[PDB]
Design a protein around this ligand. Structure first.
Ligand code: CHL
Ligand code: CLA
Ligand code: CLA
Ligand code: CLA
Ligand code: CLA
Ligand code: CLA
Ligand code: CLA
Ligand code: CLA
Ligand SMILES: CC(/C=C/C=C(C)/C=C/[C@@]12O[C@]1(C)C[C@@H](O)CC2(C)C)=C\C=C\C=C(C)\C=C\C=C(C)\C=C\[C@@]12O[C@]1(C)C[C@@H](O)CC2(C)C
Ligand SMILES: CC(/C=C/C=C(C)/C=C/[C@@]12O[C@]1(C)C[C@@H](O)CC2(C)C)=C\C=C\C=C(C)\C=C\C=C(C)\C=C\[C@@]12O[C@]1(C)C[C@@H](O)CC2(C)C
Ligand SMILES: CCCCCCCS[C@@H]1O[C@H](CO)[C@@H](O)[C@H](O)[C@H]1O
Lengths: 197, 40, 209, 153
C-alpha cells in the first residue's frame, strides 16, 4: 500500500488488501462495497483488453517502420479486404462474445455456478477467485502471487492510458503513434502538443 | 476574518459571484466563437 | 521563540493586536485590517509572506544586478521589462509548460508540508535521503541548507529569520517600484537612480508634467 | 433536400440576404471619414457578417424559400450537429448540476440544524462535491442497480 498523493489519507474502504491499492478514489466511486466488487472486475477486464489493443496498434507499426512486415495502420485496417466481409465478422464476434461474457457474468453474480462445462460434464473449473479463473486459462501454471497481480494491474493501467493517448493523437494529428514518436524524438523542442495547436 | 468568510458564504453573495463567473465565461466564448448555430 | 511584549512597534505608542504576540520573527504589531485574526489564517499568511519574500529577493537580484553591470559594461543583458518577449531556443509556451511541471511538483510537495508537517521529508526514490528541518517553511537538509546555518540557538535563529523577512519585504517593495518606474518613466531603474541623483529637486515623480 | 429545402450554399435567397446586409451596413459607412473609429467598427461588423454567412454555407445547413437556415431534428445522420450533439452536451451539463446538488443535499441532511447550510453554504464541502459530476452518469447508473437512487418510501 503506497500513497498516490503523499499526505492524503486513504479512504476507509480501501484497506490495502486488494492488489494495486494506492488509496486512489478522490470521487468516492467505490464507497459502496457492491460497487467496488463490480469495479474490480471492470478494471481487470478493461486492462486486459487495453493491453492487447495497445500491442496490436503499436507493434505492427514498429515492424512496418523497420521493413520486416508491411501492414496497414490501426485506423486503416478496418476498410481492408478480408475473406469474410466486415458485417459477417461482426456478427460472429457478437455471437461468440454474447456466449463468453454471459458465462463470465454468471461467475460475477455467484462465484461457483459456471465452473462445469455443458458438453463434457466430466471437466470443471477448480474453485478460484473472481477475475482469476486459472486452470485452463493458465496452462503454464504460473503462480498467481500478489506481485503478479500488482504487475498485471500496473501494466494494464499504463495500457489504458496508452490507448487514450493513441486515440487523441490520431484525432489531433491524423497519423499513427510510432510516427508521432519519431517526429517528436527527431526534434523534441519543436514537436510537442503545443506546436500541433 | 472567520465571520467575514461566513458572510461571503451566504446565498446571495455566492450566487452573484457564481453567475458573474458564468456570464464572463459565456461572454468570452461568444466573443471568440461567435454565431454558432450548430456543433461541428 | 517566546512572547515579546516590549518589542518596537510599527506605530509607536499604540497597542499591538492580541493575535500579533511577538513570538514570530519580524513582528512589529502591524495588522490594522485584522487579516490574521484566526490562527489558521495567521499560519497560512506566514508561509505566504515567506515564499513571497524569497521570490521577490530572487527577482530583485535578477533585475538590479544585471542592469547595474550593463551600465558599467561588464555585461550586455537586455532590459528586464521586455526580456519576456524575446526569442529563445524554444517558444515561450513550452518553456512555461515545463516550468509549470517542475515548479508544480515542488509546490505540491510544499503544499503537502503545509497541510501535514512531517509528510514529505523523505526521498520518494531513495529512502535514506531525508530533509532534517523541523518547522514549516524551513525544510533544511543537505539540499536547502547545505552549510548547516539553518539550525542553532533559539536566539540567533530568531534574528536570522527576522533579517530574511525584512530583506524580503524590502525586495517586495523594490520589485514593484522598478515595475511602476518602467511603466511611468520609459527607461531603466539605474537610469532613474542616476537621473534623480543628478537633480534631486526636480527628477522625481512630479517630473512628468 | 429534406422537406423540399435547399442547401444554403446553393440557394440564391441566402446570397441575396448576405448582399443586403452588407449594403445596409455600408450605407452608414458613408457618414464617416474612411479612417475614423466608427468606420473601423462597421468594417469589423461587415467582416463578421461575411464570416457568419460563409460558415453557414460551409457547415452544410438547409435553407428554405426565405434564405434562412432551417434545423433538422428527426435524427438524420448528416444533421446531428444541430440537435443531437448539443443535446447530449446539455444533458451532460444538467445531470452534472443535478447530481452535485443531490450529493450536497444528502451530505448536510444528518446535522443538528441542516437549514443553516442551505442559506450559508459550506464552501469546502461544495468544493469536495463539485468535481464528482464529471463521472455523474456512472454513479447515477450504479445507485440505480443497488437501489440508493430512489427512496422506496
Ligand atoms: C475497439 C473498437 C473499435 C475502434 C476504436 C475502431 C476504430 C475505427 N474503425 Mg472499426 N473500430 C472498432 C471496432 C470494429 N471496427 C470494425 C470494422 C470496421 C470497418 C469496415 C471500418 C472501420 C472503421 C473504423 C474507423 C472509423 C471510426 C469511425 O469514424 O466511424 C464512426 C462510427 C461510430 C461513431 C460508431 C475507426 C478508426 C472505418 C475505417 O476503417 O476507416 C478508414 C471502416 O471502414 N471499422 C469491426 C468489425 C470487424 C469492429 C468490431 O470489433
Ligand atoms: C475502466 C477503467 C477503470 C476502472 C473500472 C478502475 C477501477 C478501480 N480502480 Mg483504477 N485506474 C484506471 C482505470 C480504471 N480503474 C487507470 C487508467 C489508472 C491509471 C491512472 C488507474 C489507477 C488506479 C489507482 C492508482 C488506484 C485505482 C483503484 C481502483 C479501484 C477503486 C477506485 C474506483 O472505484 O474506481 C472506479 C473507476 C471507474 C468507475 C471508471 C471511471 C472512468 C471514467 C470514464 C473516467 C474517464 C477517464 C478519462 C478521463 C476519459 C477500482 C477497482 C484504487 C484501488 O484500490 O485499486 C485496487 C487505486 O489505488 N486505480
Ligand atoms: C503485464 C501483463 C500481465 C501480467 C503480469 C499478468 C499476470 C497474471 N495473469 Mg494475466 N492477462 C493479461 C496480462 C497480464 N497478466 C492480458 C493482457 C490478458 C488478456 C488476454 C490476461 C488474461 C488472464 C487470464 C484469463 C488469466 C490471467 C492470469 C494471470 C495470473 C497468473 C498468470 C501469470 O503469472 O502471468 C504472467 C504474465 C507474463 C509472464 C507476461 C508475459 C508477456 C507475454 C508473453 C507477452 C506476449 C507478447 C504480446 C503478444 C505482444 C497473473 C496475476 C490467470 C490467473 O489469475 O490465474 C488464477 C488467468 O486465469 N490473466
Ligand atoms: C431555450 C431557449 C434558447 C436556446 C435553445 C438558445 C440557444 C442559442 N442561443 Mg439564445 N437566447 C435565448 C434563449 C435561447 N437560446 C433568450 C431567451 C435570449 C434573450 C436574452 C437569447 C439571446 C441570444 C443571443 C443574443 C445570442 C444567442 C445565441 C444562441 C446560440 C448560442 C451558441 C453558443 O454560444 O454556443 C457556444 C456555447 C457552448 C458550446 C456552451 C459551452 C458550455 C460549457 C462552457 C462547455 C464546457 C464544458 C464541456 C444557441 C443556438 C448566440 C448565437 O450565436 O446565436 C446564433 C447569440 O449571439 N441567444
Ligand atoms: C538575505 C536574505 C536571506 C536570509 C538572511 C536568509 C536566511 C535564512 N534562510 Mg533563506 N532564502 C532566501 C534569502 C535569505 N535567507 C532566498 C532569496 C531564498 C530563495 C532561494 C531562500 C531559501 C531558503 C530555503 C529553501 C531555506 C532557507 C533557510 C534559511 C535559514 C538558514 C540559512 C542561512 O543562514 O542563510 C544565510 C544567508 C545568507 C548569509 C545570504 C547569502 C546570500 C549570498 C548571495 C550568498 C549566496 C551564495 C550562493 C552559493 C550563490 C535562515 C533563516 C533554510 C532553513 O531555515 O533551514 C532550516 C532553508 O531550508 N532559505
Ligand atoms: C522600494 C523602494 C524604493 C526606492 C528606493 C525608490 C526610489 C526611487 N523611485 Mg520609486 N517606487 C517604489 C519604491 C521605491 N522607489 C514603489 C513601490 C513604487 C510604486 C508605487 C514606485 C514608483 C515610482 C515612480 C512612478 C517613480 C519613482 C521614482 C523614483 C526615484 C526618484 C524618487 C521618487 O520620486 O520616489 C517616488 C516614490 C514613490 C512614488 C513611492 C515610493 C514608496 C516606497 C514604497 C517607500 C520607499 C521609502 C521607504 C522608507 C524605504 C526606504 C528604503 C531605503 C533604501 C531608503 C528614486 C530612485 C521616479 C523616477 O523614476 O525618478 C526619475 C518616478 O517617476 N518611483
Ligand atoms: C416522431 C418520432 C420519432 C422518433 C422518436 C425518432 C427517433 C429516431 N430517429 Mg427518426 N424519423 C422520424 C420520427 C422519429 N424518429 C420521422 C417522422 C422521419 C421522417 C423524416 C424520421 C427519419 C429518420 C432518419 C432518416 C433517421 C432517423 C434516426 C433516428 C434515431 C436517431 C439516431 C439514434 O439515436 O441512433 C439510435 C432515433 C431512434 C436515424 C437513425 O439512425 O435511426 C436508426 C436516421 O438516420 N429518423
Ligand atoms: C438539487 C437541485 C435540484 C434537483 C436535483 C431537482 C430535481 C427535480 N426537480 Mg426541482 N427545483 C429546484 C432544485 C432541484 N430540482 C429548485 C431550487 C427549485 C425552485 C426554483 C425547483 C423547482 C421545481 C419545480 C417547480 C418542479 C421541479 C421538478 C423537478 C423534477 C423534474 C426535473 C425538473 O423539472 O427540473 C426543473 C428544475 C428547476 C426548474 C429548478 C432548477 C434550479 C437550479 C438549476 C438547481 C440549483 C440547485 C442548487 C442551487 C445547486 C446546489 C449547489 C451545492 C453544490 C452547494 C426533478 C426531480 C418538477 C417535478 O416535480 O416534476 C417531476 C417540477 O414541477 N423542481
Ligand atoms: C479496453 C481499451 C482498449 C481496447 C482496444 C482494442 C481492443 C483495440 C483494438 C484495435 O487496435 C487493434 C487491436 C487493431 C486495429 O486495427 C483495430 C482496433 C479495434 C482499433 C481501452 C480502455 C481504456 C480505459 C481507460 C482509458 C480508462 C481510464 C479511466 C480512468 C483514467 C479513471 C480514473 C478514475 O476512476 C479512477 C481510477 C478513480 C476515480 O476516483 C477518479 C477517476 C479519475 C475518475
Ligand atoms: C508588494 C507586495 C505586497 C504588498 C502588500 C502589502 C504592503 C500589504 C499590507 C497589508 O497586508 C498587511 C501587511 C497588513 C494588513 O492589515 C494591511 C495591509 C496594508 C492590507 C508583494 C510583491 C511581491 C513581488 C514579488 C514576489 C516579485 C517577484 C518578482 C520576480 C520573481 C521577478 C522576476 C523577473 O525580474 C526577473 C528576476 C528577470 C526578468 O527578466 C523576468 C522577471 C520574471 C520579470
Ligand atoms: C475555494 C474553496 C475554499 C473557500 C473557503 C471560503 C471560506 S469557507 C467558509 O468558512 C466559514 C468559517 O470561516 C464557514 O462558516 C462557511 O460555512 C464556509 O463556507
Amino acid at each position: 500500500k503506497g500513497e498516490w498523493l503523499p499526505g492524503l489519507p486513504s479512504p476507509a474502504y480501501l484497506d490495502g488488501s486488494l492488489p494495486g491499492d494506492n488509496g486512489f478514489d478522490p470521487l468516492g466511486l467505490a464507497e459502496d462495497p457492491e460497487n467496488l466488487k463490480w469495479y474490480i472486475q471492470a478494471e481487470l477486464v478493461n486492462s486486459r483488453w487495453a493491453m492487447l489493443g495497445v500491442a496490436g496498434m503499436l507493434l505492427p507499426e514498429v515492424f512496418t517502420y523497420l521493413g520486416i512486415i508491411n501492414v496497414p495502420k490501426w485506423y486503416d485496417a478496418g476498410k481492408s479486404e478480408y475473406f469474410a466481409s466486415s458485417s459477417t465478422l461482426f456478427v460472429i464476434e457478437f455471437i461468440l462474445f454474447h456466449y463468453v461474457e454471459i458465462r463470465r457474468w454468471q461467475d460475477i453474480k455467484n462465484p461457483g455456478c459456471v465452473n462445469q462445462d455443458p458438453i463434457f460434464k466430466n471437466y470443471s473449473l477448480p474453485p478460484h477467485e473472481c477475475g482469476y479463473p486459472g486452470s485452463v486459462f493458465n496452462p503454464l501454471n504460473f503462480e498467481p502471487t500478489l506481485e503478479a497481480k500488482e504487475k498485471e494491474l500496473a501494466n494494464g493501467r499504463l495500457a489504458m492510458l496508452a490507448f487514450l493517448g493513441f486515440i487523441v493523437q490520431h484525432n489531433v494529428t491524423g497519423k499513427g503513434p510510432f510516427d508521432n514518436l519519431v517526429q517528436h524524438v527527431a526534434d523534441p523542442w519543436h514537436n510537442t502538443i503545443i506546436n500541433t495547436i | 476574518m472567520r465571520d467575514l468568510k461566513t458572510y461571503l458564504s451566504v446565498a446571495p453573495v455566492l450566487s452573484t459571484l457564481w453567475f458573474g463567473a458564468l456570464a464572463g465565461l459565456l461572454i468570452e466564448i461568444n466573443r471568440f466563437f461567435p454565431d454558432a448555430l450548430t456543433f461541428p | 521563540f517566546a512572547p515579546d511584549p516590549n518589542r518596537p512597534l510599527w506605530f509607536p505608542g499604540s497597542t499591538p493586536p492580541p493575535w500579533l504576540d511577538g513570538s514570530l520573527p519580524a513582528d512589529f504589531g502591524f495588522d490594522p485590517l485584522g487579516l490574521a485574526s484566526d490562527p489558521d489564517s495567521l499560519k497560512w499568511n506566514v508561509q505566504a509572506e515567506i515564499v513571497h519574500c524569497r521570490w521577490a529577493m530572487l527577482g530583485a537580484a535578477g533585475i538590479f544586478i544585471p542592469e547595474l553591470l550593463t551600465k558599467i559594461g561588464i555585461l550586455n543583458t537586455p532590459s528586464w521589462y521586455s526580456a519576456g518577449e524575446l526569442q529563445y531556443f524554444t517558444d515561450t509556451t513550452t518553456l512555461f509548460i515545463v516550468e509549470l511541471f517542475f515548479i508544480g511538483w515542488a509546490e505540491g510537495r510544499r503544499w503537502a508540508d503545509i497541510l501535514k508537517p512531517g509528510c514529505v521529508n523523505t526521498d520518494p526514490i531513495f529512502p535514506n535521503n531525508k530533509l532534517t528541518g523541523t518547522d514549516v517553511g524551513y525544510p533544511g537538509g543537505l539540499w536547502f541548507d547545505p552549510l548547516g546555518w539553518g539550525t542553532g540557538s533559539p536566539e540567533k535563529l530568531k534574528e536570522l529569520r527576522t533579517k530574511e523577512i525584512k530583506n524580503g519585504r524590502l525586495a517586495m517593495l523594490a520589485v514593484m517600484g522598478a515595475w511602476f518606474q518602467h511603466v511611468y518613466t520609459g527607461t531603466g531603474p539605474i537610469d532613474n537612480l542616476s537621473a534623480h541623483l543628478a537633480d534631486p529637486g526636480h527628477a522625481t515623480v512630479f517630473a512628468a508634467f | 433536400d429534406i422537406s423540399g429545402l435547399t442547401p444554403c450554399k446553393d440557394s440564391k435567397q441566402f446570397a441575396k440576404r448576405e448582399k443586403q446586409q452588407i449594403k445596409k451596413l455600408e450605407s452608414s459607412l458613408k457618414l464617416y471619414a474612411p479612417e475614423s473609429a466608427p468606420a473601423l467598427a462597421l468594417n469589423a461588423q461587415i467582416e463578421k457578417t461575411k464570416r457568419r454567412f460563409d460558415n453557414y454555407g460551409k457547415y452544410g445547413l438547409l435553407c428554405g424559400s426565405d434564405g434562412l437556415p432551417h434545423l433538422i431534428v428527426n435524427g438524420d445522420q448528416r444533421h446531428w450537429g444541430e440537435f443531437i450533439t448539443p443535446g447530449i452536451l446539455f444533458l451532460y451539463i444538467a445531470g452534472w448540476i443535478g447530481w452535485v446538488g443531490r450529493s450536497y443535499l444528502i451530505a448536510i441532511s444528518g446535522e443538528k440544524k441542516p437549514a443553516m447550510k442551505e442559506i450559508i453554504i459550506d464552501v469546502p464541502l461544495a468544493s469536495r462535491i463539485i468535481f464528482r459530476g464529471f463521472i455523474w452518469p456512472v454513479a447515477a447508473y450504479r445507485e440505480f442497480l443497488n437501489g440508493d437512487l430512489i427512496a422506496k418510501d
